[PDB]
């Protein structure tokens, strides 16, 4: 009956159901003293604390312990009364076959968990999967759907390219690149001097004003990503829809490109979500 | 019982059966991630995606992998219930003998395929072949049949000339020329500057308004093609029926020629089809 | 006085001067910790490390930062004592006009750089440019020069066609295709399962024996490239000289083609170089 | 003349000269009653006792009081008669520039110290520095040098990655992680109940059989470290040489990994040393 | 109804209820002659004198005879008329589970005692527990709450670290270190000569001017404690709130640190108290 959409991502998780929201992808099984105060979930005896700790960089996220984050997001989005729902997940546009390994472990399965001590249960009627980026096309405005466009999702580690003709797809591909590599680049020179920064606590340093990120590093990253699209797409053609958090991160620099026609998707963070979410309304409803 | 007509072409495929239509000749065996969303056919274990990828420029189209496009067109035109049909193909007016290599591989053969996962089968009672251009004469209006006319099909790569006396043919020939050479000419100067266009994604650029095609390039192409007909035909004589997509592409420029009597065939795209299609009604029915 | 020839390429750079050689086209401006141990060049304050990092896929290589690779190759080929030389570059047979943008930035210019810390300078008397593929004709054996031949360079991203009559050219063209597309095809199915390969570290995987490249993928690539030459050349005619690294990559499969007369150029890697290099001896000497 | 190599480390110090050996990195300036019985060194009036006390966890070990441990190791390795030597230190592969701050304070300097009351002096002709991990490659067996390998040093607090092509480096990086974090994890749950353990006296508890370390904690640590290498290296590729004491600590669990090609370096403790030590023979001798 | 907060500590006890205050943690069951004149409490027949004698150094203070000090503090803070109250204790941020052993022995229990001969009774409605250091965050000023801060309590024997994001915690840990170790260090060299000082009567000697504490011993202690926080926190980041009596003891030396942003909490002695005390108002009121 209900519908829930979850983009696990690699650094951020974005959920939309009865209530929408997002949080950080950090997950840790490390033992903790003051359990009351943190967000956590316990499944079949193993406990995990969310929003802190490691980052789960493993590629092919079909098997990167997509276990605690999913249930936590389901509990946060919907309410306790809800028991049966329809899940619509978003996988990268290249790892589709892994959905076979997904459905087998989820479809028609009842999951019981704690969610900060308030034990509850949940079941899912049927599971559905959509490519990343392609989903966002549905959230796109009508004025851009008619034309031949290119959905370009700039993920933390994955760039997703989906070229759409007039309501049809032509090209689909993925690139191993994203903001994580930029964070690694920054830490490569920061940790060198005397410091101990890592890819996790580095963005907050930029936000609070400790790391002085020169404007041209963003330009270098822009050139690098745009150097990873020429073999597959000519960005001057195929009016482009930038999506993902990296797009918001680089928008003021993207807007000054030598591209005839383009734009940065509004609410890009949830775009890939909302789009797929719209698709759900089309299928079950 | 049923009758189906298929013009494979070189850039476009045009089918007419219980339901008519057309699509692009692009075919690719390349591996694909998001199979659901594309049009495809799998035959004896090998899968091909239609409407995208390469273009299959091979001449003598009797052997240019006329395999996936044919079955896809048959499935799209007719319905699943249909099992036996009569196929009427259109070959160029010079490669007739290759029909011997065609019939042997098709007549009395049952083909099973997927067509986007919905497996089905189909058989063909008997195969029939007609020259290109000659077919369109049947689709022609009565007012032009009586006079001595010249059917001139301007294909993407082949120009077909068939001179008809009063219900009889006198001259028949083919020329290696068409819109593909024009696309090559345009890309020769476009790719030179900084770009990466090819013969496939170049027409769409003209359509959407990126390539500024000067009016006189069309005139140059017109002179080139009309320079390829003087040895065989005097266009002032032999009232001319222009057919093919190139005719629609150049019609407003053809209409201003110093020719006493001529015309551009209506629905030229399907003309060569409809004509031959009429012929089928004459033979089996 | 001296003469130096440099084929920048897109994946490999090939230099010949007083000392010949080649290396990889990978270039990175990324910050590096252990600078001693890598090959690098610093120009006007910006440092670049060669043989590692990105790949610079940008087409129209007249402006793809042809800056560090050039100076590094000049330093490696010649010696420190040399100050003035004559440069003979090789551009694709379609981007000639870009030579105007080249000469202006190079002719009569003195470049100072580090080359792994040993600072040095160099000047170039005059600059010269030759088409790709056409150059290799000079390196060709005499037995093939007399006949009407077709120089076919199979680059990593560009196919160069130059048809030569008896010591004269007739046809000249370029196609966007090469081994880079093959690498993209392989990674399209490899990255899908669970992996993280890209177009850079994929050839080494084939070489060391991790990727199982089926024999028929090479055949598919051969058909694709040979499907990109029919509109311009009939390979049965115009005895063919295959050049480029891709020719060595596919030679044992090229040798089994239904072509009456052909061959694979020896030392094809440097052929395009040596040929043009011979031309230099003709002009200045 | 003589050559001495010193790996200060963070928990253990490893020296090799005329006589090889190792000891603990614990250093304390705390006042002591029974000075006779402990190992100590007094430099310019300040006394320090080695093998007991604090642990000097400060990162960027270029300035973590690398003062008493160094002289103590020099005295223990060589003999009293020796006056002039050549020092070859090992720094992490990311803090190279700090060598500038090192040489200035050491090169051409005479150090006098007590070494348990037997006053002596020593001078160093010239100082040399090598990256950690990279050094161990020289100690590696010939059978592994030819292939493209990955030196992976698992330090107490630092993971050092150095990817070597055929006798050349491609990738170099550091991660803040090691056995110290594992000790912190263990104490996090041990100290909680009633105890007072710290990161220093915790390994001895495991060795003597008081802390019951479940087998799966080692697996968790293995996954954590292997989660810190995917962005930079694919361990299935790049045949891996594990080095460092942590490798010996986890070897029986490393040996059961799903890695096609790998190994644990013999005498890993001194590997990083011996390797660099070999390098010294190449330079001065 | 009433609310009472008690920080037992290890050397000092700090109570706040209807009347606030503090005293020394010294407790002795030793027989005493002149009982009138000392502060004491007798519980179930056993008498204890407060403010003199031993010091109760036992770690895991959930069971270090937290019996007489508690009742004495309750009697001193509130008045005789009060019978029922709500207790809010402060435990270290690592020994939470011991609260289970606490509540069972206190919740819903009536305690009768003497308190210097004036017999009285008291009951507690419900018991509540909070981590040390975390509590002080509530007492903190608003200007520091919004930012990502680090509460650092420097106890007599325990260092408590609690890293707070924007109103949320991320890291929580404890270290065995404090002013008691400093007192032990001082006595190690004082008792050596001819004296008989211990960890109890040593601070008073500093206060009254008998022990000449060199300024650099405080610096050594500062470095030692700051050497015990690098693995868990980078003090340059995470604006720091120093709390505890040791902070007041070292404040003039803390203020001269190379830290960009920090401060010493006002009334740090009661900070950990007041904070938790505020929390009580939030829960019951
Ligand atoms: N409000 C914001 N302002 C600036 N940058 C943001 C904001 N929200 C997210 N980002 C950036 O966008 C990135 C999030 O990418 P994300 O969409 O989580 O990757 P993926 O889609 O692959 O999961 C982060 O690295 C973050 O720096
Ligand atoms: N609706 C249209 N408007 C303008 N041009 C068209 C249209 N449809 C087709 N064309 C042009 O006609 C050509 C199609 O030729 P086609 O009939 O497919 O060749 P062939 O008959 O040899 O298969 C294309 O190159 C296209 O540019
Ligand atoms: N010794 C060799 N053996 C097998 N393949 C090779 C060898 N040398 C080069 N190649 C292949 O040839 C290609 C080099 O093409 P290249 O000549 O650099 O392109 P371009 O001429 O466009 O710069 C590479 O992709 C590589 O796989
Ligand atoms: N003989 C041994 N048996 C088991 N474990 C050992 C042995 N020797 C050292 N170790 C482990 O290896 C670690 C030493 O790491 P080390 O090489 O000193 O770090 P670094 O290289 O960063 O200085 C220690 O934590 C210790 O537990
Ligand atoms: N007014 C003061 N002036 C100077 N130092 C003080 C003062 N009050 C307390 N101290 C110091 O602070 C310490 C008290 O620490 P405390 O907060 O009791 O530890 P805990 O919080 O672990 O119980 C004592 O060692 C004392 O020397
Ligand atoms: Mg994403
Ligand atoms: Mg046709
Ligand atoms: Mg080339
Ligand atoms: Mg080490
Ligand atoms: Mg305290």
Author numbering:
A (entry chain C), B (entry chain E), C (entry chain D), D (entry chain B), E (entry chain A): 1 to 285
What sentences appear in the manuscript?
ParMs generally exist on low-copy number plasmids where they contribute to plasmid segregation and stable inheritance. Here we report the discovery and characterization of two chromosome-encoded ParMs (cParMs) from the genomes of Desulfitobacterium hafniense (Dh-cParM1) and Clostridium botulinum (Cb-cParM). Both cParMs form filaments, exhibit nucleotide hydrolysis, and possess characteristic ParM subunit structures.
The two models from the two maps (ATP 30 min, and class 1 with GTP 30 min), were identical up to the reliable resolution of the data, despite the difference in the bound nucleotides. In both maps, density due to gamma phosphate or inorganic phosphate around the nucleotide was not observed, indicating that the bound nucleotides had been hydrolyzed to ADP and GDP, respectively, and the phosphate was released. Phosphate release from Cb-cParM polymerized from ATP or GTP did not cause significant filament instability, as observed for other ParM systems, rather the filament underwent a significant structural change. The Cb-cParM cryoEM images showed obvious differences in the distribution of the nucleotide states between ATP and GTP at 30 min after initiation of polymerization.
